[PDB]
């Protein structure tokens, strides 16, 4: 029972080829644009009217002709046509004097638009040159449904067509697009038309072009475009692109050049998403592509590397094979998320990029997918808002986690084969759910890799058509040598019976034979529950999900939880580190949902004293963060600090001062960042003094710049009780950087001062007009409240003053005000803070309506209440160590 709509185009007519010409004088900051399009189309059901899409465009003329011999051959003028647009369905209808009969026709429309300023259609972007002058560029973003903002078209992904694009623009600017340049022609006194080669069959949402004065770096058939003053930061992207494209060529067994003679990447200063996979011309926001080793962090580099991998994966999964309709958008975004980490790991083996997948995708997916509002992977949509809303954690991380599950179940070679079958089959066409299963099946037909009578499709449908994921319960009738397992839907929040039955692949491992590295032994639960007969002593632990490859949580009897717990106390590395990470996150969420005694889960985490690897500590960091945030303003908070001190103080035998030795790995860097972060949060004076000194050493001249891989921590803590000269130094550094990611990190870092007078002055700089972008001014507010309770207070004190909320609201919106109020609410934990909040609401007067005020109080009250709820009592209790 999913009702949708009549927002779908009439099915009477169908595109064949678009011949698009656009003119823009964006070099002059002229923001109108003009266009003509010649659309070759097929009529299937005889009609008087051709219906396609338009948002915002104003037609000036239109006419039709027939093509009596196909697409080559001459047209014969039928007549001028009538145009009208429905603003709600965004259907434009061209109406002929005659009724057209099933054949090939040529529609020709002249039209005029304007460049968006919300980063969505054909829009404007800009940057500031080294001499202070602002320079404009026109660029595109169509995915979802915005190709209709640049030219009238059949804007649905299943209606693939060829595209021949030409653009008129300033002689002094360059145009690029999906396809290579076919030819320049200078015109008038000032201008030029750039012509592009015809595309293959593709969807409108992937069409793209850019008109700018940018520069390129290159290597063979691949370039990277950047604003001229970012040229030195484009080297990494070009390396990564070459390596990643090749890995994918080989692995999938279809080279990219099978269909395209070049692949460009471009960094666009104003960009809504992280990046967009337009065939042959992939757009990025700057933070997703630029890297500068003097100031960019290992995290930043990882973001560039994964994003490139993500969008290159789309050249096959999305571009070559596109979704028939958005219901199957996971066919794109699931594979892109998986290969975001997998292709990258194949492209830089030994940098342990693939480890990042378990915490950044699997566990991340389970968090959102444990909510009652989560959707099934297959889920339809009709309106533009409904379509955007599909681009969520289910389309991305969930899909990517289940695909990773399938990949392991099928085996590497079968997997590759399956995909090559799929891609080959649906090449230059649309795909749905079942066509993928067909492909994967073919590569294992007769090979007896699945139990007899079971399809690839039988399995995937249980995961694809059902919201959420299961928890697999494992109960042992111990001293008696059996195990019972059973499955129910997992919620973060509640236990609610569910009729659907996931076909779940499982395996398991016991204490004497502790091998987690093979995947030959996959078993299936295809019913609600089952008895597993077995060999294992009541003294040995068992653990079910090998390296958390299966997309499900696992719960055990308190017995087996305690066996496990003991085993990791005596020898902390006795279980695979990903499985330790599974146990940590599983225990955490099982306790929160009330499927497991909190006391048990907390007992299980004491083992971390001895822990030394990246995955488990990353998992732990999420549980600890939650507890930290709920205890913070409360009396019991001291005992939490003590408890966590106990957990880390050992592993705090790393180097955080100068951490960076050339030999320490990616994973090490993450680990160092997580542990030092905690130590500094807790006020380890060693941590606070070293960071403080480093910053002082760089701001003073005494010493070198702080290495980027340690800057996040060092600049934030280190600023805690720093003096005016170090605050100003860091502030001037940010204002002089032309690097967005740097700027953001420094804005956050300034936010960590404990000095309320610094914070308020800092906030004042974000108001009025220094060179913040809008997003950065908002960022300053966020830095201040995210710094700690002292910034929150600084912010509240600021907003109490009515003249100050006046300035605040005139330069940021009221939405930024309501946003900050929510943030403050999320961080009030005690009576004294609740007073401060209520005082602010009241002081703000007519800016806060009753509804919102009620909401703020509600989220704040939930925090105060939390301290004496069952959780919270259970926890304050447990923190009665002695």
């Amino acid at each position: 029972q999913a009702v949708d709509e009549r927002y779908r185009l009439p099915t009477t007519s169908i595109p064949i080829h678009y011949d698009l010409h656009l003119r823009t004088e964006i070099h002059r900051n002229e923001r109108t644009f003009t266009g003509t399009v010649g659309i070759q189309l097929q009529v299937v059901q005889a009609t008087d009217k051709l219906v396609m899409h338009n948002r915002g465009l104003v037609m000036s003329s239109a006419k039709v002709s027939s093509l009596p011999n196909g697409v080559t051959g001459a047209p014969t003028l039928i007549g001028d046509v009538q145009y009208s647009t429905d603003t709600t369905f965004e259907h434009i209808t061209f109406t002929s004097p005659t009724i057209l009969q099933p054949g090939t026709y040529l529609l020709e429309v002249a039209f005029q638009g304007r460049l968006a300023t919300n980063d969505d259609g054909f829009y404007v972007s800009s940057y500031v040159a080294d001499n202070g002058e602002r320079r404009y560029l026109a660029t595109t973003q169509f995915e979802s449904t915005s190709a209709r903002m640049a030219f009238p078209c059949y804007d649905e992904p299943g209606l693939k067509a060829t595209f021949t694009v030409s653009i008129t623009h300033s002689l002094s600017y360059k145009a690029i697009s999906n396809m290579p340049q076919k030819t320049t022609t200078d015109i008038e006194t000032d201008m030029r038309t750039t012509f592009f080669e015809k595309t293959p069959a593709m969807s409108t949402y992937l069409l793209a072009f850019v008109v700018s004065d940018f520069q390129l770096r290159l290597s063979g058939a691949q370039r990277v475009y950047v604003r001229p003053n970012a040229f030195n930061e484009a080297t990494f992207a070009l390396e990564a692109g070459v390596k990643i494209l090749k890995v994918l060529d080989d692995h999938l067994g279809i080279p990219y050049d099978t269909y395209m003679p070049k692949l460009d990447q471009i960094a666009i200063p104003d960009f809504a998403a992280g990046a967009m996979e337009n065939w042959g011309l992939v757009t990025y926001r700057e933070q997703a592509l630029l890297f500068n080793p003097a100031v960019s962090t290992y995290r930043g580099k990882t973001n560039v590397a994964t994003t490139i991998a993500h969008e290159y994966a789309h050249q096959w999964f999305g571009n070559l094979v596109s979704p028939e309709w958005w219901e199957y958008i996971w066919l794109n975004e699931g594979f892109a998320t998986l290969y975001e980490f997998y292709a990258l790991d194949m492209a830089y083996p030994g940098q342990e990029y693939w480890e990042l997948f378990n915490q950044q995708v699997i566990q991340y997916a389970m968090g959102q997918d444990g909510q009652a509002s989560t959707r099934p992977m297959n889920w339809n949509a009709a309106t533009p808002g409904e379509i955007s809303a599909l681009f969520d954690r289910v389309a991305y991380d969930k899909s990517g986690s289940v695909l990773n599950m399938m990949r392991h179940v099928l085996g590497d070679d079968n997997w590759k084969a399956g995909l090559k079958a799929y891609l080959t089959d649906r090449a230059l066409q649309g795909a749905v759910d079942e066509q993928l299963y067909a492909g994967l099946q073919s590569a294992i037909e007769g090979k007896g890799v699945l139990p007899n009578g079971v399809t690839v499709a039988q399995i995937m449908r249980t995961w694809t058509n059902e919201a959420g994921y299961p928890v697999l319960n494992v109960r042992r009738s111990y001293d008696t040598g059996d195990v019972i397992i059973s499955q129910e839907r997992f919620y973060n929040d509640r236990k609610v019976p569910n009729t659907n039955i996931w076909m779940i692949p499982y395996n398991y491992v016991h204490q004497a034979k502790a091998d987690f590295n093979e995947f030959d032994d996959f078993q299936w639960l295809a019913t609600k529950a089952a008895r597993i007969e077995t060999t294992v002593p009541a003294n040995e632990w068992i653990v079910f999900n090998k390296q958390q490859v299966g997309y499900y949580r696992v719960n055990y009897d308190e017995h087996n939880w305690e066996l496990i717990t003991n085993a990791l106390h005596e020898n902390w590395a006795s279980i695979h580190r990903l499985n330790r990470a599974q146990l940590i996150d599983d225990a955490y969420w099982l306790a929160r949902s009330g499927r497991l005694d909190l006391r048990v889960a907390l007992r299980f985490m004491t083992y971390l004293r001895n822990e030394r690897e990246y995955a488990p500590w990353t998992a732990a960091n999420v549980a600890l963060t939650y507890f930290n945030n709920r205890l913070r303003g409360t009396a019991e908070y001291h005992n939490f600090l003590i408890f966590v001190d106990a957990l880390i103080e050992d592993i705090y035998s790393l180097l955080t001062i100068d951490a960076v030795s050339p030999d320490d790995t990616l994973l090490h860097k993450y680990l160092v960042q997580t542990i030092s972060t905690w130590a500094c949060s807790m006020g380890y004076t060693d941590c606070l003094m070293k960071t403080a000194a480093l910053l002082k050493a760089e701001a003073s001249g005494t010493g070198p710049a702080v290495h980027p891989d340690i800057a996040s921590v060092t600049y934030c803590y280190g600023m805690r009780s720093a003096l005016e000269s170090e605050f100003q130094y860091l502030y001037r550094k940010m204002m002089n950087s032309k690097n967005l990611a740097e700027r953001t990190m420094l804005i956050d870092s300034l936010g960590c001062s404990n000095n309320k007078e610094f914070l308020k002055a800092f906030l004042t700089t974000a108001l009025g007009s220094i060179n913040y972008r809008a997003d950065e001014r908002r960022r300053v507010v966020q830095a201040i409240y995210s710094g700690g309770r002292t910034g929150v207070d600084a912010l509240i004190e600021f907003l109490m003053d009515p003249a100050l909320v006046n300035e605040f609201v005139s330069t940021l919106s009221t939405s930024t005000l309501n946003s900050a109020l929510s943030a403050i609410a999320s961080r009030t934990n005690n009576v004294e803070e609740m007073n401060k909040l209520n005082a602010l609401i009241t002081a703000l007067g007519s800016r806060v309506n009753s509804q919102t005020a009620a909401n703020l109080r509600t989220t704040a009250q939930a925090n105060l209440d939390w301290v004496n709820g069952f959780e919270g009592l259970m926890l304050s209790n447990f923190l009665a160590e002695a």
């Binding site: 998403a273 992280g274 994003t307 993500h310 892109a336 975001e340 681009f391």
Partner: peptide, 5 residues
Amino acid sequence: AAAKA
């Protein structure tokens, strides 16, 4: 696309 972190 790739989303914003």
